[PDB]
Enzyme design. Structure first.
Site, PDB file in Angstrom:
ATOM      1  N   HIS A 101       8.817   9.049   5.916  1.00  0.00           N
ATOM      2  CA  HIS A 101       7.910  10.180   6.208  1.00  0.00           C
ATOM      3  C   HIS A 101       7.440  10.419   7.763  1.00  0.00           C
ATOM      4  CE1 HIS A 101       4.330   7.876   4.926  1.00  0.00           C
ATOM      5  NE2 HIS A 101       3.822   8.554   5.722  1.00  0.00           N
ATOM      6  N   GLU A 141      11.516   6.103   1.060  1.00  0.00           N
ATOM      7  CA  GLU A 141      10.802   5.530   2.339  1.00  0.00           C
ATOM      8  C   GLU A 141      11.020   4.699   3.226  1.00  0.00           C
ATOM      9  OE1 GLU A 141       8.398   8.023   3.297  1.00  0.00           O
ATOM     10  OE2 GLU A 141       6.634   7.314   2.555  1.00  0.00           O
ATOM     11  N   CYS A 161       1.298   4.328   8.636  1.00  0.00           N
ATOM     12  CA  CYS A 161       2.494   3.997   8.174  1.00  0.00           C
ATOM     13  C   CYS A 161       3.576   3.570   9.116  1.00  0.00           C
ATOM     14  CB  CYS A 161       2.885   5.463   7.318  1.00  0.00           C
TER      15      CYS A 161
END
Lengths: 174, 174
Positions: free
Chosen positions: A31, A55, A132
């Site tokens: 993402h 992911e 992230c």
């Protein structure tokens, strides 16, 4: 404590971070990957082997991008029960290694989606939006290995989730 | 170590086990619940308040079934990172308390189904088919509390899953 070269593999990328596993292999969280671009690190998308599973995103470049690095072991997931380190870099440049005890590979409901990943409990100052892509690593002997990349966390921040390569292992009702 | 009265709450039920939380409340794992019967413990189903959420089943009887017991705390899930004990009874009568470090509440793919539960890693001789329904417990001060009931385990047996009451807590991408 991670040596400077290990930290040097942690790399700003899109809305988060990614990690150079070797001179040609870079892993990141799906993402955070920038959209609507023609290149990554100056390389046309077409010259890159991009692999994506939920992911977990991996790039293999056709040229050496970090020839200064040795190849590192990439595990398909983190050893359950092991205390791993999340190598967080902040936008300010601050390094924030966080100790996390890893749990099971599973699917977590995240903003409407069931997301395959691995959870861990923060032991250590937690992860925040923008983290992230940061790698989850641990030592085996005198070597560091990487086993996942940061994806998400509970509202309290006590539980984190990293994306991993490993799929769904066999579980049976008892 | 659990006292004899605590073990006395662990009860053979259907194809597995269940646990008396109080004189009127009994918890068990949904898939072990006997089918096509008219009574549980001699009580017509209609006189029982049966609550079911995924693999977590709770009965509240309208009469005292175990008046010898005090009410025990039932947590909605086990504290992440805590070492709990799974109170396994075998068909032979053998008691096998197993130490398990609890992980996150999540969904695990189990024989085609995504099953909501909580995973843990065996620390201790593992769980086997027939163990489903055994309670996951821990101590708070001088009291024992129950937080889940055994449902499943990985092929290796190193990872176990218990059913819990708690739902899906807030997780966000970072």
């Amino acid at each position: 404590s991670a040596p400077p070269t290990l930290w040097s593999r942690v790399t700003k990328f899109g809305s988060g971070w990614g990690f150079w596993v070797s001179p040609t292999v870079f892993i990141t969280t799906t993402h955070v990957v920038p959209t609507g671009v023609k290149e990554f690190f100056g390389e046309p998308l077409s010259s890159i082997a991009i692999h994506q599973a939920g992911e977990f995103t991996q790039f293999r470049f056709s040229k050496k991008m970090r020839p200064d690095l040795t190849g590192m072991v990439l595990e398909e997931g983190c050893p359950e029960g092991t205390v791993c380190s999340v190598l967080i870099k902040r936008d300010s440049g601050e390094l924030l290694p966080l100790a996390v005890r890893m749990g099971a590979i599973a699917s977590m409901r995240i903003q409407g989606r069931l997301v395959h990943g691995q959870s861990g409990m923060l032991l250590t100052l937690g992860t925040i939006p923008g983290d992230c892509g940061a790698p989850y690593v641990h030592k085996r002997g005198n070597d560091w290995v990487v086993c996942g990349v940061h994806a998400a966390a509970t509202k309290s921040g006590n539980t984190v989730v990293c994306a991993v390569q490993a799929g769904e292992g066999e579980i049976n009702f008892e």
